[PDB]
Design an enzyme around this catalytic site. Sequence first.
Site, PDB file in Angstrom:
ATOM      1  N   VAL A   1      74.586  11.126  39.587  1.00 12.62           N
ATOM      2  CA  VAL A   1      73.074  11.332  39.087  1.00 12.62           C
ATOM      3  C   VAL A   1      72.711  13.098  38.293  1.00 12.62           C
ATOM      4  O   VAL A   1      72.930  14.162  38.872  1.00 12.62           O
ATOM      5  CB  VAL A   1      71.737  11.608  40.417  1.00 12.62           C
ATOM      6  CG1 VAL A   1      70.124  11.976  40.334  1.00 12.62           C
ATOM      7  CG2 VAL A   1      71.991  10.046  41.068  1.00 12.62           C
TER       8      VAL A   1
ATOM      9  N   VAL B   1      71.524  10.354  45.109  1.00  7.82           N
ATOM     10  CA  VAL B   1      72.361  10.113  45.290  1.00  7.82           C
ATOM     11  C   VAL B   1      73.384  10.204  46.481  1.00  7.82           C
ATOM     12  O   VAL B   1      74.619   9.722  46.284  1.00  7.82           O
ATOM     13  CB  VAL B   1      72.795  12.383  45.957  1.00  7.82           C
ATOM     14  CG1 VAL B   1      73.468  12.907  45.939  1.00  7.82           C
ATOM     15  CG2 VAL B   1      72.149  12.962  44.288  1.00  7.82           C
TER      16      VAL B   1
ATOM     17  N   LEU C   1      73.625   3.476  58.174  1.00  5.38           N
ATOM     18  CA  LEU C   1      72.888   2.871  57.872  1.00  5.38           C
ATOM     19  C   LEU C   1      72.933   3.539  55.908  1.00  5.38           C
ATOM     20  O   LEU C   1      72.609   4.807  55.620  1.00  5.38           O
ATOM     21  CB  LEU C   1      71.520   2.734  58.530  1.00  5.38           C
ATOM     22  CG  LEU C   1      71.827   1.894  59.775  1.00  5.38           C
ATOM     23  CD1 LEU C   1      70.537   2.622  60.532  1.00  5.38           C
ATOM     24  CD2 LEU C   1      71.372   0.729  59.960  1.00  5.38           C
TER      25      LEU C   1
ATOM     26  N   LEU D   1      65.285  -3.239  64.943  1.00  5.46           N
ATOM     27  CA  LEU D   1      66.236  -2.462  65.068  1.00  5.46           C
ATOM     28  C   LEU D   1      66.692  -3.222  66.591  1.00  5.46           C
ATOM     29  O   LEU D   1      66.938  -3.035  67.481  1.00  5.46           O
ATOM     30  CB  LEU D   1      66.167  -1.694  65.209  1.00  5.46           C
ATOM     31  CG  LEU D   1      65.182   0.002  64.490  1.00  5.46           C
ATOM     32  CD1 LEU D   1      65.431   1.223  64.117  1.00  5.46           C
ATOM     33  CD2 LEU D   1      64.775  -0.582  63.562  1.00  5.46           C
TER      34      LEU D   1
ATOM     35  N   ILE E   1      70.244  -1.483  69.436  1.00  3.17           N
ATOM     36  CA  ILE E   1      69.173  -0.338  69.848  1.00  3.17           C
ATOM     37  C   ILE E   1      68.615  -1.100  70.868  1.00  3.17           C
ATOM     38  O   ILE E   1      68.068  -0.362  72.290  1.00  3.17           O
ATOM     39  CB  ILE E   1      68.633   0.682  68.564  1.00  3.17           C
ATOM     40  CG1 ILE E   1      68.807   1.187  67.430  1.00  3.17           C
ATOM     41  CG2 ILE E   1      67.830   1.284  69.791  1.00  3.17           C
ATOM     42  CD1 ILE E   1      70.271   1.652  67.903  1.00  3.17           C
TER      43      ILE E   1
END
Lengths: 592, 592, 592
Positions: free
Chosen positions: A24, A50, A420, A475, A478
């Site tokens: 970038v 980024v 993630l 999730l 979790i």
Amino acid sequence: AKMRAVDAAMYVLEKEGITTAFGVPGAAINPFYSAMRKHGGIRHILARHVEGASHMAEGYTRATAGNIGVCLGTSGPAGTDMITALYSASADSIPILCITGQAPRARLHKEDFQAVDIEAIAKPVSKMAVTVREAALVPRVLQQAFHLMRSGRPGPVLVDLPFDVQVAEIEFDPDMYEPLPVYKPAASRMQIEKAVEMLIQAERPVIVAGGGVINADAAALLQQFAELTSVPVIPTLMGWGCIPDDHELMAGMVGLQTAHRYGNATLLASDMVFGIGNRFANRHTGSVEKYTEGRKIVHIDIEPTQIGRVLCPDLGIVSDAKAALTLLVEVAQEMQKAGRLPCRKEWVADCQQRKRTLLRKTHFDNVPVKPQRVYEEMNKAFGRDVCYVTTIGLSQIAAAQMLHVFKDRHWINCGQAGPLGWTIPAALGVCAADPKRNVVAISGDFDFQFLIEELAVGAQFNIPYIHVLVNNAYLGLIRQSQRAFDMDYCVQLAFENINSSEVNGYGVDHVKVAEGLGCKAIRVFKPEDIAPAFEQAKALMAQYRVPVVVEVILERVTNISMGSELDNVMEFEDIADNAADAPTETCFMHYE
Amino acid sequence: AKMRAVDAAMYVLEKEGITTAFGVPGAAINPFYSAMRKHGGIRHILARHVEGASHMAEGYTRATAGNIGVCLGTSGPAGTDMITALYSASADSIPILCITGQAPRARLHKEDFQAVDIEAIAKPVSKMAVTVREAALVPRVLQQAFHLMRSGRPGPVLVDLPFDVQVAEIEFDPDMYEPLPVYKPAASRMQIEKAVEMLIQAERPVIVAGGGVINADAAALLQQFAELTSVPVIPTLMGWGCIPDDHELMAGMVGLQTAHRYGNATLLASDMVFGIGNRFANRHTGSVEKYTEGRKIVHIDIEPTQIGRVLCPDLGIVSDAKAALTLLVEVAQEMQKAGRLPCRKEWVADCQQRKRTLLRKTHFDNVPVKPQRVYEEMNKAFGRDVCYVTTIGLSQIAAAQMLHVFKDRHWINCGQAGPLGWTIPAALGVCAADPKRNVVAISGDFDFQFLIEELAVGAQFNIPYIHVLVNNAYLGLIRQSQRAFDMDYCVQLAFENINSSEVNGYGVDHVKVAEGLGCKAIRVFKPEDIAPAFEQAKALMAQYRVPVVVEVILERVTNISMGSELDNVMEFEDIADNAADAPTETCFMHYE
Amino acid sequence: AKMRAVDAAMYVLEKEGITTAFGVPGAAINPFYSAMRKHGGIRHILARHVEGASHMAEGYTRATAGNIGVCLGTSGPAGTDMITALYSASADSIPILCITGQAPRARLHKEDFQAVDIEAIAKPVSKMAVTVREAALVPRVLQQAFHLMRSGRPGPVLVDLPFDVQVAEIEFDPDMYEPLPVYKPAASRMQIEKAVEMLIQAERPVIVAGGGVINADAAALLQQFAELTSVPVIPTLMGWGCIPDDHELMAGMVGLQTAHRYGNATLLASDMVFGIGNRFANRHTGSVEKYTEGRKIVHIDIEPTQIGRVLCPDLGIVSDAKAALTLLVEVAQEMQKAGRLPCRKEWVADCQQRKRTLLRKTHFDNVPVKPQRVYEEMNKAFGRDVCYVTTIGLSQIAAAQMLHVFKDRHWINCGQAGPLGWTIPAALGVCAADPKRNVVAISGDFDFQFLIEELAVGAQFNIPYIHVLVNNAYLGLIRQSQRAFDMDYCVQLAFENINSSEVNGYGVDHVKVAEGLGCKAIRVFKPEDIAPAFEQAKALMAQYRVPVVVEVILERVTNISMGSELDNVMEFEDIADNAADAPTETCFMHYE
Ligand SMILES: Cc1cc2nc3c(=O)[nH]c(=O)nc-3n(C[C@H](O)[C@H](O)[C@H](O)COP(=O)(O)OP(=O)(O)OC[C@H]3O[C@@H](n4cnc5c(N)ncnc54)[C@H](O)[C@@H]3O)c2cc1C
Ligand SMILES: Cc1cc2nc3c(=O)[nH]c(=O)nc-3n(C[C@H](O)[C@H](O)[C@H](O)COP(=O)(O)OP(=O)(O)OC[C@H]3O[C@@H](n4cnc5c(N)ncnc54)[C@H](O)[C@@H]3O)c2cc1C
Ligand SMILES: Cc1cc2nc3c(=O)[nH]c(=O)nc-3n(C[C@H](O)[C@H](O)[C@H](O)COP(=O)(O)OP(=O)(O)OC[C@H]3O[C@@H](n4cnc5c(N)ncnc54)[C@H](O)[C@@H]3O)c2cc1C
Ligand SMILES: Cc1ncc(C[n+]2csc(CCOP(=O)(O)OP(=O)(O)O)c2C)c(N)n1
Ligand SMILES: Cc1ncc(C[n+]2csc(CCOP(=O)(O)OP(=O)(O)O)c2C)c(N)n1
Ligand SMILES: Cc1ncc(C[n+]2csc(CCOP(=O)(O)OP(=O)(O)O)c2C)c(N)n1
Ligand SMILES: [Mg+2]
Ligand SMILES: [Mg+2]
Ligand SMILES: [Mg+2]
Ligand SMILES: [Mg+2]
Ligand SMILES: [Mg+2]
């Protein structure tokens, strides 16, 4: 020979193998971009975060043995968005090269706009992180960077380039530039002889093949050594693929989550672990006392300080995996010419007997869909040359315990850090590294969302692959871990989408999002519609040349098998002891 | 009184003012989440990226004077995703509290899954970053954290909690817990008398009001001091709002990009800068020699080491801005009772004369739309109590030079770090801090995309605000900066969307993406359709209670006014000297 | 094979070459001392300051090519007393191995008695500084340490050993232990050919031979290359000795202080500097612009990031000095067999002309004694195999510009850090490294006093050498530097000693101190008594086997030649153009 520092940097990068870059741009790094355009020879992919550019670089590296992915950004927050990837790359012993812009040297300690001490921030998660203090050092820091990224235990490097350093004139003769020699320790004949002498007195040995084997590009030699000694192989999650899954000697995977029931049982029955290119990861071993009980340990690693870090081995040898395996094959062949290699027919046999009875059910006709049915259909739909990319979740745990891989670097997975958002850019990085690679990604809905916008990179530049999205509006992992705390709290993603009834209160409409980002997408509610969807996906890829998302609507709650010890893994969903329930095990099915 | 360390942490957080938390749960931080649910009193918002949770916390803090935004995450990559926000918060002298999970202490130096030395990584960009080594220290580290976050120069803190430390039993009496006193230096009567004595001998003085005034909650007192002395006020970008834009003494803003032509001219004409709660930022001053030429400098700051860092002031006083302004008002009132405050009628007058002739054109009827027309329509459409949230780009530069603000903390902007992706979560954080706040965000297409998925947080939880999206299918600012290098390279986002002709090759379909994420969205092609769209947006917010995106299709290339010195700012687009071309200047228009 | 971690460390140290260790024991490092005694084979010298032990190790290393000096200490302040030596060693590119004890791991973050984070403190001044976290890693960290200390740019390492880690049992087979291969980059034929092709077209070339040549053990090859090409040699202070001083091609030394008038003039007359194993140190070059004016630069260094750090070279090659010089000799020989090496008779000639006319007076009959007369008498009194040890001051500056050395590692000097107190322990370390070495040290009175108690080490263990003490009751160098500030302030050491009239108010009685510490000492007031004193000293050494101090009472104030540029060195004392005034120049005197 008079030239800008950044112009000299292009010669170095070229002679050093780089043809691709993800990034970038920004004002502080414009001189670099200018030199890259003037020089030619590097393909730039513009990311839409980024962090995305960083993880693309990781995938590019992990795809093929000599590859070094390059990540480009401006000063300030660009550098702080690359820390997660530097960590991920460090953690898995693989290199990326990060290059950031920076404010002029005179102003580094005045609070110059977007000026941060990226050097101090990146230090703990890279082999080198340095701010280049002179123009003439620009080519030299890169020279040193490539040495570090290839040598010893590989890892990532960050190079921070002040604006005035980039644009200053230097004298540089590119014809005189020589890449530095790569440092790698090698085992001695004596050490390897001792290791093989030890192996032959073992009654029930196993080889544990780690990501070091893959790092050293030594898969063929590992397979050959196992074949010559007739010793079953257990790949680590990072070593997965270094011997094909349908090989007679591959005895499965071991650990607390991404493992097989037969793998764990074979290890617990063994009397030796011959560790090559592995460390003894937390989720591979469980309690070290239990992993080592009644069992001898050999450990071959390139890094001295990785031997004895978690457990104390009976032998322990410092060596690159290719060099060590070359000797191991040589010494095994000499033992074979004498009458000194034992027959291991019985031990190999009952390893295989475990492998065809200690299974997990995949063939579910339920609606809403059970996730384990998805992995069954993937095995059927895709060829033997498939290359899977994934990160973390119930999505990847179950994928790891039910999918099959048949070559090295056909499982691209950030095993130690698991950030993630990794999956999409990592996939795109693999595709950029190899346009012939049959890339297929697996994500859960949360992982998919983190860096969802990077799909538009795949659309803008025409980078096709297939992304399997298993959606439970949760999730998942979790939620499962919260069972021990007796709760279900802050882990749901479901809501009534005011623009989309079709999704039945699952929340985000991934089809609309994917299409808006320039991609194709198909949603599946029933298990029998999965196979046709994958064929549809392959067709869409060929004509439109973009990422194609296949979303599968899962049942909301499914508990995947796992535990805190190898002898303690819990089976919540149905187990299986025959092929009707688990039809895609390699023993039951020939892979294309 | 026997209790888990995390249970004690809830008492501390409660007594210390916290009612809200943004985060993403994980196994390593589950004990914390368990204690939070058991205790009650904290509202948790689930983010869809940890970076999103971080920037929500920043917005929550910046919204209202006593607020401390809290950011919650697991071990490993969660912590490395918060570094950008810690930087951003540090850079702008504002606090957030980051809390991360971590592997048990016994295993911090074995390579335990998702275990990283977040302490070393975060050190350079926080007032404190610490791994808590004992259970009984958990409440004490938080106690110390709130002292640091409120005292001296405010900044962020990271607290890293090993799993075994969280769950261990401690003895704790919450009735005995006392928040620590807040440290703030205060100016002396003598120092302030000298400052006012100096101010009165100045012929053409200006007050430069910085974000320190806002940090100290001293806007009313600043306005009062300016009124009593009759001295024009120049707010910094971070001080913007501490005196209302329609006030007779507000003389505009100064600098290289987010500034006015009249502001720069008034400063260049002045013979003194009375700096209160400012540092002298790079893009505010340009070359320090030029900013200071023929001009006396007073500098009042809470932090000793901020005085003399960029330039050497004629006076320089260490003080909290509220304490100093309380004295300044008192001393000014005494000067007024004597005949010692000069009349400044003429100087105030010709500051105002600049303010109504040195303008920039906004009233463009062009199609495709010119961005400066968008800010004109926003001024008309929204009331005086509007609260703008923005980050970086031609989108925010032009916004800063054409929008108007009428109260403190009605311009929420990460001025020193400007990380792309900030705008959406920051907006959501402000809304969570104050459901009565009329929040309106401005983004360009690239900023909008970085963390686009956080819109779904606004949908899941019902957090409404208006997001103005100005779309040029470009990295606008960077394209403009590349002019000096004679190029247009890696800065375009345009492509032919295979699912959307309507967008005319602009690439991403933000309407489809926004709707898929559960929000409402309107696209505008013509300037006359902007006003109706904003009214439509206000209606949709009221009934559906979700974020509403208003996308404006801009012309591809527009060069915004900017330069490298105050006397050197370049006007590419049409200037203006009357209200017909610039109808929303506060002198020409009464604000609701 | 079961064994304490410290027991295994003894095997590693022995296989890795260690036979000597300097240290100070303590409770936290007792297990190490216990293992050392049990194993045998290492001679321990007890120091009387940890700093003393550190600098002894430095001297031991610097004495002979493969040597690695070892420094042993307890936890806490022992480690903080070694930082100066780690810095000194790092700075001059030489290794020492420091081993410190440490509190148990469980207590590292409770404030355990004498527990400090030595790892963090030592990081900036060592190639590696590490706290060993597992017993089984003790032998592996040492394995890694010896690789780093020998490879690339050599430097020191600190190993920090927690008590419980030392005493824990591990499995270790010492027969299987293999030292790692040493990494060194090597130049290519192509690069060296270009360098020689460049050298040949130079009219007036000079070789600058740095401490890298000595580090690489390549003195013979350097001399041979100079001889083959007929190119004059300028050693740096750290390269001094790699060609003998009486060699016809040795053209003197260059710089601001430790330099010759002929050296500086030759360099200013040259048209090329062929740098081998040098960096371009601040006090060698002065202003880089002046050093490089009208002059080409070649730079060969083992470390990439040393090339271009201070100036940008015309060529620049990454290589070990021995490998590069092997090629340079080979390529030179091939050029000679063709008719391609030019005759350099005239340039060599007028370099020698400078060398016999641009001198400094040494033959002073003054009382009190002028220091330059001392160095003259030293050259006469000691043989050609003499080995000088010194540190910093007017003492060592004048020594460097007037003494002569005839082999490599016969000038032992901490050239970059110059820590006062270094001289005594460094000398003792050289003597311990080689009992046949004719070691002679030079100190001023202040240097001598810093670590004066280490003379008693020389007495307790019978380690003989001669220490020349030049006493002016002044911080001489600093007094001279204070002239520019027009003062003489806090630099005098003189007082009327209430126990000693004989010293005439010079203060400390070094003869009584030296005798009390168990050594012998002679004081000299007249220049003609210096020669007999040295003969007396040689006799006392032979019989008593202890350090012998020869104190010379100097005149109080003498200004030594120095300047801020090569063309700007000031001569305060008498210059000389004939041998009568400077009789010990090598062209006027045969050495042994
Ligand atoms: C949710 C989740 C669950 C997981 N569950 C499991 C599980 O059940 N079981 C499991 O095994 N894993 C599991 N993993 C992955 C696990 O955490 C580790 O990443 C993995 O086991 C480590 O692989 P490895 O031992 O091969 O070490 P690697 O990370 O692959 O590295 C091992 C060694 O290779 C060495 N090396 C590098 N280059 C060379 C060279 N050229 N020659 C020789 N050596 C070299 C390095 O020094 C290093 O010590 C899981 C991950 C996640 C995301
Ligand atoms: C693209 C872009 C363009 C920009 N262009 C401009 C421009 O043209 N002009 C411009 O001015 N800005 C511009 N900015 C913003 C600029 O970079 C700085 O963020 C801003 O000027 C700094 O504001 P400040 O001086 O008020 O300092 P702040 O960051 O607000 O802080 C100033 C001081 O307040 C002190 N302080 C904290 N608390 C207290 C207290 N309670 N009491 C007293 N003091 C306290 C601190 O010690 C600190 O030194 C731009 C930003 C970007 C994104
Ligand atoms: C009071 C005082 C005055 C001084 N005055 C002067 C002065 O007048 N003139 C002067 O010259 N010095 C002077 N010195 C010393 C000076 O500061 C430096 O120590 C000296 O100049 C450095 O010499 P060098 O260039 O050989 O660098 P070194 O410190 O010896 O190292 C040079 C290079 O060797 C490389 N290297 C290491 N190993 C190898 C290998 N195996 N092969 C190839 N390269 C290798 C390193 O990477 C390094 O860049 C003075 C010191 C003091 C105390
Ligand atoms: C940055 C970050 N934050 C939090 C985590 C913890 N993480 C582990 S898996 C997981 C849930 C992922 O759910 P999803 O991607 O939807 O897949 P599922 O488990 O539901 O199959 C989370 C939150 C992480 N790995 N990284
Ligand atoms: C993480 C990060 N990377 C790069 C930059 C440099 N950045 C400055 S503005 C800008 C372009 C933003 O374009 P857009 O958001 O579309 O708004 P426009 O300038 O086009 O109005 C970029 C890339 C940044 N601030 N942060
Ligand atoms: C630890 C330390 N402190 C201060 C200095 C500065 N140092 C340079 S030489 C010098 C004076 C030494 O005087 P002396 O050893 O008597 O030699 P003289 O200059 O008189 O010949 C000093 C103080 C130093 N090198 N190290
Ligand atoms: Mg995103
Ligand atoms: Mg899910
Ligand atoms: Mg844009
Ligand atoms: Mg002492
Ligand atoms: Mg002295």
